[PDB]
Amino acid sequence: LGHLAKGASLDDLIDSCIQSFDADGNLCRSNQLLQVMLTMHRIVISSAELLQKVITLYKDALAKNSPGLCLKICYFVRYWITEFWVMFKMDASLTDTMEEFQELVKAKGEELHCRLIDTTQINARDWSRKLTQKKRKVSLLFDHLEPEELSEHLTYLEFKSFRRISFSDYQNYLVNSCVKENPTMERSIALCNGISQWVQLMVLSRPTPQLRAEVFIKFIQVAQKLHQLQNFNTLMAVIGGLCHSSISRLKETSSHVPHEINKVLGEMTELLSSSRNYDNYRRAYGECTDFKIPILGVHLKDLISLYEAMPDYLEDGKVNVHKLLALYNHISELVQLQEVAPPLEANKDLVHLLTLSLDLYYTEDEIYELSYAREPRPVVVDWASGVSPKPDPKTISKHVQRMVDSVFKNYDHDQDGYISQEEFEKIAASFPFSFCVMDKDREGLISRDEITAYFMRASSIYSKLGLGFPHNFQETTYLKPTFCDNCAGFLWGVIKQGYRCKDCGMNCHKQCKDLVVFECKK
Amino acid sequence: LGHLAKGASLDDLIDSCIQSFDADGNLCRSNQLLQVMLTMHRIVISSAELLQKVITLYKDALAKNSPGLCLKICYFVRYWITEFWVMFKMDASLTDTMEEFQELVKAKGEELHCRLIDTTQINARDWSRKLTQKKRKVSLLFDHLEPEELSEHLTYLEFKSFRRISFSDYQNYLVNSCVKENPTMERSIALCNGISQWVQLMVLSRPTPQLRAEVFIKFIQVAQKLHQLQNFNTLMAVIGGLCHSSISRLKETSSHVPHEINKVLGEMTELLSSSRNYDNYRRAYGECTDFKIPILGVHLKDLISLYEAMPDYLEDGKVNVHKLLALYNHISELVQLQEVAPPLEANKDLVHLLTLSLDLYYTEDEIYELSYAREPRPVVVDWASGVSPKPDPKTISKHVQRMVDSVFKNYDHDQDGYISQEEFEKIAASFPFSFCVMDKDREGLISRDEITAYFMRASSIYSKLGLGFPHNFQETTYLKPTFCDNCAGFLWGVIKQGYRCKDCGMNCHKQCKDLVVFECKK
Ligand SMILES: [Zn+2]
Ligand SMILES: [Zn+2]
Ligand SMILES: [Zn+2]
Ligand SMILES: [Zn+2]
């Protein structure tokens, strides 16, 4: 390629970038300097300061009275804005320096220069996808569903989650040394951990008899289908959940059920095993063609190792471009994946159900206590968390909303506002250890507000976020015996035994009043 | 009488006491020096030290080789032991000094002297009442009962409570300046306050309509009957409860119901009113013949005023006997009352019910909150408490026991272990604001353990003493949704949601586990 061994001054890297364009605007046949610089520059300096360098360059060249260097500069900038919009949307300082530059070239007001650097039209066209950027029919019931369907929709989820990660996110993860400041990756983490805990809690959810290990079998089948779908990350998630200490400590279940599977589990462990370092996975992933998913944990370890290996600035005082080239190559290799869409089966109701299923935040100790409570007496997804991910009430409230809307459209049959409690129980099976205190309008029928209650309570326990609809409460002295409409329990005391809602007259303990799940207009 | 103006040395008061006896043992025709000394001596010195004076006297007289002075001393002592046993039972130091004296006269072993001072036989005869020291038929239902019956049984109660107070108790109340060390008076206090609060809570207990003021009328009638029965103390209690600020603040009830009564209430207030000082009550009580009750509050104020007026020891260095005479006269006047038994109607089941009804310990603020909750917007029994009386779990546990046994014998009809919930509700009417969380063996029938539960919970709330049968509890992680067998409410949390009983498998919140009312052998 174009060659820098000891590297080069940042000023000259910029100069080269601009000189890759010509007065007519055409771009050089070899761009890789543009690519590497425009993508990686954020490690040496901020994009604001860089743009400022370009501005000093522009004022200079305009004062030199050369239309060609100005035009080239503007074409370079236009290319920056057009080819990476994301950097501009996310970065505030960059956008403000862009407005500054625009107002500068407008105040000077020389012809086409202004037209070339406009953000407005590009921004307009970017938000311009109103439409997304007869299917098939699947069921929301976990008890009867096929492991391939589960693996498929989990792969859809994981793939979207991955796609959300961008070049600049990897760059940011490299510069900040793993802060949760950058959301996309955190969401992928939540998704992985959530899948693991979903597996573990789903196994523990079933009653003491055989059935738990039947669920075990079913998740191992899901794992197989994930393997054949070449989705390695969620594969690591489900196996990592099946191999966890709390699930591994159930001997009765292990002893109950079949061998072929245990052999398969051995195979999945040995495959996914971390013997230094994940070489089995490295070669497995090597033979994979077309659609694939990275297990981005080890790849991020690779990125970090690369970042720490090479010095950012060289001892010569110049910029080390070997580093920027290497990181660009690795990150580009990763982003490359998101171009190929998954083979199959987009169904968004099941997606809604799973996105809600998979929001789980639990202590290891809690799960050990459940597992131990059920049974009296090492393949690690990590990606080691120095900090655990935390839940966002907005995405979870949307999740519940979408879940309700979907279970409504699918299973209501336009019949009343209700669905049969049998089908509901079957859907509930897909939510481990989920229960909500309520009393029902009809026997064997569930209101929309009632199911919203159930899922809101479920999500409230799962995310460990107490949340509920606002009521106007007033501390009330109850003269006749009365019970909590939230926790279904007696209000103790002589006086001031609870809180009454002014408008709807709902009765609650002080503890239950903030977390009440039902609406005030009852 | 025998005359001391400036009073006399304690040694000489003792000498006189002994000299009132003769060698043959016969007692002087005028004893009042014996009476006053033997009763009141505890204010100048303890009975132990006094007995020790008698012992030095005995050793001295025996060494003087005079059989008459020894015999007289022994006869005096025998009279002390025989005529006041209570002083000897209650006082430990006295009893031990008595054993010392007995072992002394036994070690010297001179004839009859030992026989004369023996405590054993007197003690034997004192405990010797195995029998108490066809009636009539009354009902345990408050809704239909006659004000005269209520006033009658309340008078029985108050009279027993009063009888419990002894000479030495008044003396002790005089010396310690009102410490709750002496129980009998404290019990009378509890009884008065309990009656007041029973009145107030009974009025507040009924629903918002007219009926509360009907109960008001009924208590005013009870008050009238108490007046005609010449029972002034509980009269003061019930009127004092009817005139309380919390009951007086109900205007709707006042406006609802009749005048003749309000005139009568005016009469009861003006009578019982404290205009200095209670002269109306003084003359009312003056015209009273035979059976009467003191309103011992003002009389104790009289005793205190007497005690503070006169100097214990005179400036001459001698004992002021004017004081001892005055206090003896007043206290003797009081004790005199307990000799005449009340005119009527001993029924111990209703007594059991009332003794349990009347154990109440409430904050003024609590009752103000109930009264205020029912109604949105000065004749004082006191006897001012610098310290409020506190409940004793033993007497309350016995109370419940006796209550259950009585409601069992009376209302069961030897039919199953159950009584109808209608009759039970009617009995419950007599316990204001009383409720207990349970579920029942049979619809419309109540177990003996069930009613024991109800009354134990009622008493637990009333006395503000949490109490319950012991279970062996173990902190339990519940895998399936479950509810508190005590508070009838949901057990929150992922893990460690409650406590399970090892033997009977009872489920409870941590808060409910100590206060569980049912037995473990279920
Ligand atoms: Zn509650
Ligand atoms: Zn409300
Ligand atoms: Zn409870
Ligand atoms: Zn038990």
Numbering used by the authors:
A (entry chain A), B (entry chain A): 53 to 185, 193 to 436, 449 to 593
Please share text taken word for word from the publication where this structure appeared.
An intriguing aspect of lymphocyte development is that the generation of a population of self-tolerant immune cells requires Ras activation by two distinct guanine nucleotide exchange factors, Ras guanine nucleotide releasing protein 1 (RasGRP1) and Son-of-Sevenless (SOS). To identify the structural basis for the regulation of RasGRP1, we have determined two crystal structures of RasGRP1. RasGRP1 is maintained in an autoinhibited, dimeric state, which is released by the coordinated binding of diacylglycerol and calcium second messenger molecules.
We determined a crystal structure of RasGRP1CEC at 3.0 Å resolution. The first structure includes the REM, Cdc25, EF and C1 domains and suggests a structural basis for autoinhibition by the regulatory domains. In contrast, the RasGRP1 helical hairpin (residues 355–398) in the absence of Ras is rotated ∼15° away from the active site with respect to its orientation in active SOS, which is consistent with an open conformation that is poised to bind to Ras. The regulatory module of RasGRP1, containing the EF and C1 domains, interacts extensively with the Cdc25 domain. Metal ions are not present in either EF hand in the crystal structure. An electron density map calculated with phases derived from the model for the four domains of RasGRP1CEC reveals additional electron density for a peptide traversing the Ras binding site in the Cdc25 domain. This electron density can be assigned unambiguously to a portion of the linker between the Cdc25 and EF domains, but strong electron density is present only for the central eight residues of the linker. The visible portion of the linker shows that several residues, including Val 450, Val 452 and Trp 454, dock within a hydrophobic groove at the base of the RasGRP1 helical hairpin. Clearly, occupation of this site on the Cdc25 domain by the Cdc25-EF linker will prevent Ras binding and nucleotide exchange. An extensive dimer interface is generated at a twofold symmetry axis in the crystal, burying ∼2500 Å2 of surface area between the two subunits in the dimer.
